[PDB]
Amino acid sequence: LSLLVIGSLAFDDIETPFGRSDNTLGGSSTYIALSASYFTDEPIRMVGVVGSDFGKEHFDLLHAKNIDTRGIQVIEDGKTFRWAGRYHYDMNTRDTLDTQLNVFAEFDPHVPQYYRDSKFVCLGNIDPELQLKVLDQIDDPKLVVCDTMNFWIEGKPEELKKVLARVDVFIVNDSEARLLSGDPNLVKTARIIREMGPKTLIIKKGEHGALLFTDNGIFAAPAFPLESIYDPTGAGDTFAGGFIGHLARCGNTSEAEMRKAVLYGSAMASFCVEQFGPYRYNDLDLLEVDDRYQSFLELS
Amino acid sequence: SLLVIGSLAFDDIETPFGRSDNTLGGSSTYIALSASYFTDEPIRMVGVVGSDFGKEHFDLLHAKNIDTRGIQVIEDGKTFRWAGRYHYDMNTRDTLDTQLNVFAEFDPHVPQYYRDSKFVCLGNIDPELQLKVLDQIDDPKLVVCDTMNFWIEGKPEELKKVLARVDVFIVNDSEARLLSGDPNLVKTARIIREMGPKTLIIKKGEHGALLFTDNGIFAAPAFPLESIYDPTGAGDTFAGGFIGHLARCGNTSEAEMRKAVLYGSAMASFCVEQFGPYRYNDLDLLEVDDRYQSFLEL
Ligand SMILES: Nc1ncnc2c1ncn2[C@@H]1O[C@H](COP(=O)(O)O)[C@@H](O)[C@H]1O
Ligand SMILES: Nc1ncnc2c1ncn2[C@@H]1O[C@H](COP(=O)(O)O)[C@@H](O)[C@H]1O
């Protein structure tokens, strides 16, 4: 039930109408790994790259969740990926103010030999060409999950479609989905997107619920009524982490398991949004996670 | 991942303030219900009940995701029965009656699909039965066990056979002294550990617990103001919280065991609030987490 996580590792300058957090630890793989760690018994594997500015306090955070960082390269004198985002009163949508690929621009995604036998692969948000280069290095994956971002949907359409043709599960939010389909109807959008390759598609409408589209039909995961949203950053990636984490834990990829997996993902995302950055995970415990899952189950 | 054995029964419980007859009980029941609060996969149960063990009881276990395929049902038999009486100290008790019934000639059979269990809890029951079950587990990572004066006095030799093969042994202070023959709990711990158990936990009713290992003694203070109405099942719900937490995290280090002791104490403190295991009908995970935090701080 080994799990390998790929994605960005970065520092974010986050702004909402109520407050801000600069130089915040972030990146899609950070959120995915921290969330998934609540499901695996063995160390989560990470492949990525950071600069010399990536302090050891950040490495200690990951190691505290028993995350294996041997696959993370540190570029001497290089700079860590940076991102700036701004939210508004709807506390869901956001503007990307700045994006500096930095070390990820010239990244050579080498997956160490001891990671090539990974069974569950999560191709987190990052350049589709890198996502593909990593996938090509995994010998026999049981399940490939992937998510992207408007940046790549608009910047590298063709490359993205190449990766979409080789993934089992594609996770997107409703904005990205409509951008990819060119039609506002989510049902038609799902069809258009699934025809690009992904057998399973999950459309997460912010913290307003998630839709699971498979050959067996549609599953609507309810929203948590009074969720306290303070910072949406990382929500979609923590969702992906709980989703693949659950599947990696039970090792079964059936329909029923994917539905429960969506519920776990929603539960993890509901905790993520409670504070700036990934810090709600500092003290979040299993009893709390189990309790939140039950709420979502009951609502579904 | 977690397999539980022990008694399944109906208890006639009496205290100076009230009584509860034909109450669902048994060590297996208390351990399993408590442990379910910690595991995310069905707890496995091996045991036996009579034709008088109604659907309502199986439904209660099933409501907590407990797998009961390992429980046998004797169509012309009666479920294990016990009668106990508590006093004003609301801790010690007299066993007024014990009817092994179906557990008398019970040949424990662990179905094939339980054989790979990693965490095994040999709950209070005839030591001969506890051994027979353990002998059927392929390669367990941790074996926990508790007993009772009934067995300590009745089958000491058979019990000692079980103890030579368990990782963690859980007893209350009365059982501990009875086993050691000396009132000093520190000396008692050394004598009991010499019987085999590398880890010993002496739970003093609801007055705190002591964890003895090669690294020393850990004291889990008591919750000074807990509402005790029925102590029945306390020690077993303690064992359940203990092995349940470990089963879920998969780690059996000293550090996790001290935390597991705190979780067990939390579960026990809720169990005593009502007759039988019924406080668990409405108990939710956040209440448990809060109770745990209090024990942690103490
Ligand atoms: N182009 C990009 N590629 C990879 N990660 C990004 C990009 N832009 C922003 N991010 C990161 O993605 C995170 C938020 O993801 P999320 O809210 O789950 O969509 C932030 O912590 C950023 O570091
Ligand atoms: N000899 C025995 N073997 C197994 N279980 C017993 C025995 N005597 C009483 N019990 C059960 O153990 C429970 C209480 O355990 P406890 O207070 O945790 O020691 C009751 O619900 C009884 O059904």
Concatenating the DSSP letter of every residue in A20-54 gives EEEEEEE-HHHHHHHHHTTT-SSPEEEEEEEETTS
CB of A96 closer than 8 Å to CB of A83: yes
User: Can you tell me whether residue A193 is helix, strand or coil?
Assistant: helix
Residues 6+ positions from A200 with CB-CB distance below 8 Å: A168, A169, A170, A212, A213, A214, A258
Paired residues of B146 in beta bridges: B170
3-state secondary structure of B144: strand
Experimentally, the structure was elucidated by X-ray
Smallest CA–CA distance from B291 into chain A, residue: A287
Q: What is the resolution of this structure in A?
A: 1.9
User: How close does chain B come to A118, measured CA to CA in Å?
Assistant: 21
- The rounded distance, in Å, linking the Cα atoms of B86 and B89 is 8
Instruction: Give the length of chain B.
Output: 298
Distance between CA A113 and CA A246 in Å, rounded?
25
Q: Residues with beta carbon inside 6 Å of ligand 1?
A: A 8, 10, 12, 26-28, 31, 83, 99, 125-126, 149, 151, 233-237
How many CA within 13 A on the CB side of residue A281?
27
For residue B234, report the distance from its CA to the centre of ligand 2, in Å. 10
For a ligand 2 pocket test, name from B7, B53, B172 the mutation site with the most ligand atoms within 8 angstroms of its C-beta. B7
Interior/surface letters B60-96, b for 16+ CB within 10 angstroms, e for the rest: bbeebebbbebbbebeebbbbbbbbebeeebbebeee
| Separation CA B52–CA B73 (nearest Å) | 9
Mutate to test the interface with B, among A39, A40, A287, A289 (most CBs of B within 10 A): A287
Nearest to B149 by CA among B206, B51, B82: B82
Distance CA B123, CA B236 (A): 8
CB contact under 8 A, B248 and A286: yes
The CA–CA distances, whole Å, from B271 to A250, B12, B83, B278 equal 31, 17, 18, 8
- Of B147, B236, B151, B246, nearest to B197 by C-alpha is B147
CA distance A98 to A79: 15
Helices (H) and strands (E) in chain A, counts: 10, 13
Find residue A71's DSSP bridge partners. Answer: A47
Of the candidates A41, A285, A294, which has its C-beta nearest B289's C-beta? A285
Question: Which residue has the least CA distance to atom 10 on ligand 2?
Answer: B26
Helix or strand holding residue A68 (H, E): strand A67-75
* Lookup: tokens for B145: 């066990």
Q: Tell me, in angstroms, the distance from the centre of ligand 2 to residue A89's CA.
A: 59
Q: Which residues pair with B20 in a beta bridge?
A: B13
The answer to whether the Cβ–Cβ distance between B38 and A294 falls below 8 Å is: no
Instruction: Give dist(CA B296, CA A78) in Å, integer.
Output: 44
Tally C-beta pairs within 8 A across A and B.
22
Q: Which residue has the tokens 């929203």?
A: A223
Query: Is residue B70 lining ligand 2, measured as CB closer than 6 Å?
Result: no
Binding residues of A for AMP: 12, 27, 94, 152, 234, 237
| Contact in structure between A210 and A266 (CB atoms under 8 Å) | yes
Residue from A6, A22, A9, A32 nearest A231 by CA: A22
Nearest to A135 by CA among A164, A101, A177: A164
Cβ A209 vs Cβ A221: under 8 Å: yes
A69: CATH: 3.40.1190.20
Q: Considering CB atoms only, which of A41, A287, A294 is closest to B289?
A: A287
Residue with tokens 């389909």: A181
Provide the 8-state DSSP code for B98.
E
Domain tally, chain B? 1
Strand partners, B44: B3, B67
Q: Residue B253 CB: number of other CB atoms within 10 A? A: 10
| Residue burial B213-233, b: 16+ Cβ < 10 Å; e: rest | beeeebebebbeeeebbbbbb
Min Cα distance A61 → chain B (Å) is 19
| Residue of B155, B122, B72 whose CA lies nearest to B243 | B122
The whole domain housing B146 covers 1-298
- Are the beta carbons of B204 and B210 closer than 8 angstroms? yes
> B170 is written with which tokens?
């859980």
DSSP alpha helices (H): ranges in A86-233? Answer: 128-135, 150-155, 157-164, 174-181, 186-194
Which of B37, B289, B292, B293 to substitute to test the interface with A, most A CBs within 10 Å? B289
Residues of B in contact with A287 (CB under 8 A): 37-38, 285-286, 288-289, 292
Q: A82: which 2 tokens?
A: 């940076």
Rounded Cα distance between B224 and B298, Å, is: 10
Contacts of A286 in chain B (CB under 8 A): 38, 248-249
Residue closest via CA to ligand 2's atom 14 equals B233
Both tokens of A61, joined, read 């955070």
Pairing type for strands B80-86 and B67-74 reads unpaired
Please check whether residue A278 is in contact with residue A31, taking contact to mean a CB–CB distance below 8 angstroms: yes
Report the candidate in A2, A1, A41 with the shortest Cα–Cα distance to residue B252. Answer: A41
Closest CA to B218 of B199, B231, B237: B199
Nearby residues of A279 by Cβ (< 8 Å), 6 or more positions away: none
Does an H or E element contain A259, and which?
helix A255-272
Q: Interhelix angle for A255-272 vs A28-36, to 10°?
A: 110
Helix-strand-coil percent breakdown of chain A, rounded to 5? 40, 25, 35
Question: For residue B33, what is the enclosing H or E element?
Answer: helix B27-35
Cβ within 8 Å of residue B244, ≥6 positions away: B2, B34, B35, B36, B37, B38, B39, B43, B263
Contact A293, A263 (CB under 8 A): yes
Which of A8, A230, A231 has most ligand 1 atoms within 8 Å of CB, for mutation? A8
CA-to-CA distance for A7 and A127, rounded, in angstroms?
9
Distance CA B108, CA B97 (A): 24
Tokens describing residue A102: 């930095």
**Other residues' Cβ atoms within 10 Å of the Cβ of residue B140:** 16
- In this structure, how many other beta carbons lie within 10 angstroms of the beta carbon of residue B187? 12
Number of neighbours of residue B138 by Cβ within 10 angstroms: 10
The owner of tokens 């001290």 is: B258
- B169 in contact with ligand 2, CB cutoff 6 A: no
Task: Please report where in the chains the tokens 């399944």 appear, as a residue.
Answer: B8
Report the distance separating Cα B24 and Cα A62, nearest Å. Answer: 46
A36, A49, A146, B133 from A105: Cα distances, Å: 26, 10, 20, 59
Strand stretches in chain B, DSSP E: 2-5, 9-14, 19-25, 44-50, 67-74, 80-86, 93-99, 119-122, 142-146, 168-172, 199-203, 209-213, 216-220
Assess contact for A210 and A190: CB atoms under 8 A.
Answer: no
- Ligand 1, closest atom to CA A173? 19
Tokens standing for residue A53: 């500015």
For residue B283, the chain A residue with the least C-alpha distance is A291
Residue B102 phi/psi, 5-degree rounding, is: -55, -25
